[PDB]
Structure formats: structure tokens, C-alpha cells
Amino acid sequence: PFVKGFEPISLRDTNLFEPIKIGNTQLAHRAVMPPLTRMRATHPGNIPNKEWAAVYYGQRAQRPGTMIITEGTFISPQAGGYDNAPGIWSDEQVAEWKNIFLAIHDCQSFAWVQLWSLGWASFPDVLARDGLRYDCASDRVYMNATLQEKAKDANNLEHSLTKDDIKQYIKDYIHAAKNSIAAGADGVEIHSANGYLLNQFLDPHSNKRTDEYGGTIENRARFTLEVVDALIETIGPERVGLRLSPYGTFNSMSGGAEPGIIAQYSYVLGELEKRAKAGKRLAFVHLVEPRVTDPSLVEGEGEYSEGTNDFAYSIWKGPIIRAGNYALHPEVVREQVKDPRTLIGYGRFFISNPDLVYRLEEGLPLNKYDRSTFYTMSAEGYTDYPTYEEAVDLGWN
Numbered sequence: 001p002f003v004k005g006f007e008p009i010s011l012r013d014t015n016l017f018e019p020i021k022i023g024n025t026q027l028a029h030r031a032v033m034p035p036l037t038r039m040r041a042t043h044p045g046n047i048p049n050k051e052w053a054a055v056y057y058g059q060r061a062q063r064p065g066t067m068i069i070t071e072g073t074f075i076s077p078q079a080g081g082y083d084n085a086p087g088i089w090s091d092e093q094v095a096e097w098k099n100i101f102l103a104i105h106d107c108q109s110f111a112w113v114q115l116w117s118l119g120w121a122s123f124p125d126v127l128a129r130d131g132l133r134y135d136c137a138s139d140r141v142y143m144n145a146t147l148q149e150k151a152k153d154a155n156n157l158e159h160s161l162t163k164d165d166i167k168q169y170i171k172d173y174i175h176a177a178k179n180s181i182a183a184g185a186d187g188v189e190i191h192s193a194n195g196y197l198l199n200q201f202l203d204p205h206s207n208k209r210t211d212e213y214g215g216t217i218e219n220r221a222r223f224t225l226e227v228v229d230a231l232i233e234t235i236g237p238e239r240v241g242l243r244l245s246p247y248g249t250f251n252s253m254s255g256g257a258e259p260g261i262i263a264q265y266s267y268v269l270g271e272l273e274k275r276a277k278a279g280k281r282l283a284f285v286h287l288v289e290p291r292v293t294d295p296s297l298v299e300g301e302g303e304y305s306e307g308t309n310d311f312a313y314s315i316w317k318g319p320i321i322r323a324g325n326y327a328l329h330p331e332v333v334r335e336q337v338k339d340p341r342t343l344i345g346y347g348r349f350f351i352s353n354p355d356l357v358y359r360l361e362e363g364l365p366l367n368k369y370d371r372s373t374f375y376t377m378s379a380e381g382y383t384d385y386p387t388y389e390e391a392v393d394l395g396w397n
């Protein structure tokens with residue numbers, strides 16, 4: 001059904017529907033499909049879904065000139081631990097990704113692979129099954145008591161990364177990025193947000209290291225910036241974006257309660273702008289908003305009201321994608337896209353609205369999403385959400 005009580009506003013007259021160049025791509029509008037884990041990849045081997053994924057992405061690519069960022073995609077076995085999330089390190093994975101990107105490109109839209117590593121958010125027993133470490137910044141701190149107990153029970157305690165482990169992660173990012181581009185992707189997004197591995201190095205709650213990868217702002221940023229530099233060099237800065245969540249508390253990150261947190265993210269952005277002024281500007285920075293500190297909470301819950309991402313605009317001078325509870329708040333979008341280099345990511349309501357862009361353009365009702373099929377191995381709740389005209393036929397109006 002449609003979302004009850006939602007009063008839609010047409011956004012056709014705004015910068016949301018002005019073209020913009022992002023890296024090598026030419027967008028027709030600024031409504032972005034952000035990375036959304038859906039768990040339809042098959043086991044063993046973390047292989048993209050051969051039946052439904054190309055259809056799902058093709059559906060959401062249907063407006064020409066749409067930017068699509070894929071679900072988090074593991075860069076290597078050691079970076080993973082979720083059986084039904086895809087990877088892009090292997091030939092078998094690449095083979096299906098080719099079909100998925102083909103479906104997106106057939107719509108004259110664009111595909112960016114989000115490159116993912118889990119760190120302490122992984123499942124230590126699943127890793128142990130595969131002979132893999134349970135990786136983190138500092139084994140002195142665990143993400144929560146459940147995982148700590150699981151780690152003990154699996155005889156796979158947290159492993160503080162060594163410098164050599166970090167070098168291997170960088171090699172994995174490079175390999176996964178080369179595979180992404182060879183498979184046909186228009187670019188990659190480095191996931192350094194939402195409490196996964198890179199974010200764990202950025203955050204002073206998870207990172208208690210005293211080597212060159214922790215203990216200062218500069219040190220905590222080093223791993224993320226080494227990944228950024230490795231990908232700039234191998235696939236070009238215009239094929240690389242970076243995702244950050246300054247105010248996130250998901251997966252036990254500090255968020256705004258850490259008064260040093262904006263200096264940490266300011267440093268990262270300044271380092272990116274320094275690179276840009278030297279001729280190597282990333283295609284974009286993707287920020288999760290304090291509107292959503294935790295995406296497991298329903299829209300309107302978990303909103304941090306004591307800080308904003310405004311600081312980023314004074315530092316970084318390229319495109320910024322903003323995500324978090326924007327679908328239900330066109331009035332907020334209307335104000336924020338007045339800035340001419342701002343794009344808007346719509347997550348949960350892109351799940352439920354394959355024709356979201358049209359609905360935004362025309363001010364139409366939105367399909368309610370069904371959380372119970374976010375992660376199920378089904379076409380149901382994946383490819384069977386109706387377009388507006390289809391919903392009207394089913395009587396949803």
C-alpha cells in the first residue's frame with residue numbers, strides 16, 4: 001500500500017531534476033539510489049543473484065541518467081562474513097555483475113560498486129568456518145557482548161590488524177576495484193561509514209591503537225586515506241567516491257557524543273580537498289545524515305539534533321550526496337538541493353518504489369516498504385514492488 005498520511009510535494013522545479021556530472025557519468029537528475037544490502041547473493045562463494053538482482057537494479061535504473069550505488073560488496077573473503085552478501089573478487093562473481101551492470105546501462109543509467117569490509121561487524125563463527133580472522137582495529141574493544149561471546153565460542157577472538165594485514169586489505173581493495181571497472185562499473189564507492197572496518201579505524205571508540213594507525217586524528221584517518229589513494233591511482237579519482245557517517249552510532253560508533261568527532265571528519269575531508277587541489281578530485285563524498293544515526297530504526301527515530309553536516313561544505317568543494325530520511329521530507333530536500341552540488345540518496349523508499357524518481361518528480365504517493373523482506377532470499381519484497389500506475393490498478397489509491 002501507499003504510505004498513509006504522507007503529503008507528497010512535486011520536486012520537478014528544483015535542482016533535484018537538474019543534470020549534473022559525477023565522475024565520468026552524466027546524470028539527468030540528483031536522486032541517487034544509495035547502497036542497500038539485500039542478502040540475495042548465493043552461498044557458497046558470495047555470488048550475485050542470477051534470477052533477480054539484474055531485474056531489481058534495472059527496475060530502479062528505469063529513469064535515464066539515474067545514479068545507482070550497489071549494495072555493499074565484499075572485496076575479499078577476509079573482508080566478509082555474510083553468506084548472502086555479494087563479493088567482487090572472483091571470476092564467478094564478476095560474471096553476474098556484468099549482467100547487473102548491463103541491465104543498468106540498458107536504462108542509460110550508471111552503476112557504482114560499494115566496496116565493503118566488515119571488521120568487527122562480521123560473524124566470528126562464520127569467519128572461523130572459512131579459516132578467516134575476526135578483524136578489528138583494537139582487540140581491547142568489541143562491538144557488543146553478543147559478538148564477543150560468539151567470538152569466544154568460535155575460538156576466533158578479535159584480531160587487531162597488523163600493518164601487513166592492512167597492506168593486504170589495500171591490495172584487496174585494488175583488486176576488487178579493478179574487477180569492478182573491468183566488469184563494466186562506472187566507478188566504486190569506498191565504504192568508510194556505518195561502523196564497518198574503515199569507520200572502526202576512524203572512530204576513537206573502536207580504535208585504541210598506539211601505532212601509526214591510531215592515537216591521533218591523522219593516524220585514525222590513515223587506513224581510509226591509503227585506500228582512497230590506492231584507488232585514485234589504479235582506476236582514477238573520477239571513478240572513486242567515499243562514504244562517511246560523522247554522526248552515526250550504528251555498529252557502536254561514537255557519533256556526536258564524541259566532541260572530537262567533527263575534527264576527525266574535517267581532517268579526512270581536508271585531506272580529500274588537498275588531493276583535489278593537486279589535480280586528483282574524488283567524484284563525490286557521500287554523507288549519511290544525523291537524520292539517521294542508525295538505519296535499523298524507523299524514520300524519525302534516532303535523529304541527532306545537535307550537529308549537522310554543514311561543516312563538510314566549507315571543506316570539500318566537490319559533489320556531496322546526502323542520505324537519511326529524505327523521502328518522507330520533500331520540504332527538507334527542496335531547501336538542501338538549493339545548493340548546486342548536492343545530491344540526495346533515497347534508501348528505504350527506493351527499496352519499495354522502483355519508479356521513485358518519477359514519483360518525486362510528479363509529487364506522487366510512495367509505496368510503504370516491508371522490512372520483513374529486506375534480507376530474505378525472495379523475489380517478494382525485491383522485484384515485486386509496483387510502479388505508481390501498477391499500484392493504482394491494485395487499488396492502492
Ligand SMILES: Cc1cc2nc3c(=O)[nH]c(=O)nc-3n(C[C@H](O)[C@H](O)[C@H](O)COP(=O)(O)O)c2cc1C
Binds near residue numbers: 034374
Ligand atoms: C536494508 C538496508 C540496507 C542497507 N545497506 C547498506 C549498505 O550496504 N551500505 C551502506 O553504506 N549503507 C547501507 N544502508 C544505509 C542506507 O544506504 C542509508 O544510508 C539509510 O537507509 C538511510 O537512508 P534512508 O532513510 O533513505 O533509508 C542500508 C540501509 C537499509 C535500510
Ligand SMILES: NC(=O)c1cccnc1
Binds near residue numbers: 037193194250
Ligand atoms: N548502514 C549500512 O552500511 C548498512 C549495511 C548493511 C546493512 N544495513 C546497514
